[PDB]
């Protein structure tokens, strides 16, 4: 039949995919250090012989919202949030390094510093931070310097042991990977530490998802979705009527 | 399941699966002290756990 049936179907299909991207945003409102995902549609025309009447649209992710997340003051010593722009460099389960903004850190039984996702926290030597096992008081600095008190030591024996690797690259050069870690679009790009990134210890950075912004985008995808499915029915209606040209 | 490449194009569009609660973290912040007249109740100021 007419190709407008599939031209509208290819549009309704993308609206559902855009709806899925907004659904993931609203599910992650309470998530810690979550960067909102933007949804956009690209107009692609079928170039060739004939009148230029058919143009497809596909939904794609143009970028992410890198605005500062909501800061939650918790009073916990091992809670860190990046003041302004900046990232925390961590290595995932496989070992590939990446940037994260979740500062819900913790100390394991061996002293290794991890975050809430389990990623190991990189240090001054581009290696995971391993603090002494018998600690007494962890006091993270504003610049990322970790000053710990050995167990049984006097309060005046406060010494720095490591400095968290904070990286502030261009946000437009970062893409979210398959596990929520932002990495460089260009492969084999070294993550260079920055001396301007600051860590506000004792607070946790929340999500930056604008709940109303997603809701008002939802009510427009639904209407656009319903208009296209009416086009599918009216293209079906036209073909059924034209079925009476071979009756003879 | 091929990934990466052009993530800002329709070819490399990535969709999430939602959210979850990974851990319920215990906040072991030292609490305030209650002064009671019972002589058999005790308290630890600073790190420490009673053993039973």
């Amino acid at each position: 039949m007419d190709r407008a049936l599939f031209l509208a179907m290819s549009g309704a299909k993308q609206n559902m995919q855009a709806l899925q991207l907004r659904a993931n945003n609203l599910a992650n409102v309470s998530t810690t250090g979550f960067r909102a995902d933007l949804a956009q549609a690209r107009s692609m025309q079928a170039y060739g012989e004939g009148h230029p009447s058919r143009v497809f649209s596909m939904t794609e992710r143009p970028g992410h919202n890198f605005a500062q997340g909501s800061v939650i003051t918790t009073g916990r010593d091992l809670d860190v949030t990046i003041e302004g722009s900046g990232w925390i460099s961590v290595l995932d389960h496989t070992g590939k390094e990446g940037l994260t903004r979740n500062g819900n850190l913790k100390v394991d039984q061996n002293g290794m510093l991890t975050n809430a996702s389990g990623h190991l926290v990189l240090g001054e030597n581009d290696a995971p931070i391993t603090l002494p096992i018998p600690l007494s008081k962890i006091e993270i600095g504003r610049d990322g310097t970790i000053s710990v008190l050995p167990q049984g030591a006097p309060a005046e024996e406060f010494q720095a042991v490591d400095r968290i690797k904070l990286v502030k690259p261009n946000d437009q050069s970062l893409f979210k990977d398959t596990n929520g870690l932002f990495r460089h679009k260009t492969p084999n790009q070294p993550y260079e530490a920055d001396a301007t990134v600051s860590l506000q210890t004792g607070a946790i950075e929340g999500s930056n998802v604008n709940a109303v912004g997603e809701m008002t985008a939802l009510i427009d995808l639904q209407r656009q979705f319903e208009m296209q499915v009416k086009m599918m029915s009216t293209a079906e209606e036209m073909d059924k009527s034209s079925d009476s040209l071979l009756r003879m | 399941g091929q990934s990466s490449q052009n993530t800002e194009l329709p070819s490399g569009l990535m969709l999430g699966a939602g959210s979850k609660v990974v851990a319920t973290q215990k906040v072991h912040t030292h609490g305030n002290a209650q002064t009671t007249t019972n002589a058999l109740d005790m308290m630890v100021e600073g790190d420490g756990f009673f053993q039973v």
Binding site: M44, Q45, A46, Y47, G48, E49, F56, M58 | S11
Partner: peptide, 19 residues
């Protein structure tokens, strides 16, 4: 109208610069 050779297909690229 008619022609003696098949018409070419239609190109639907996500980036016209790469065709």
């Amino acid at each position: 109208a008619l022609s003696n050779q098949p018409p070419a297909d239609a190109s639907i690229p996500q980036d016209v610069a790469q065709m």
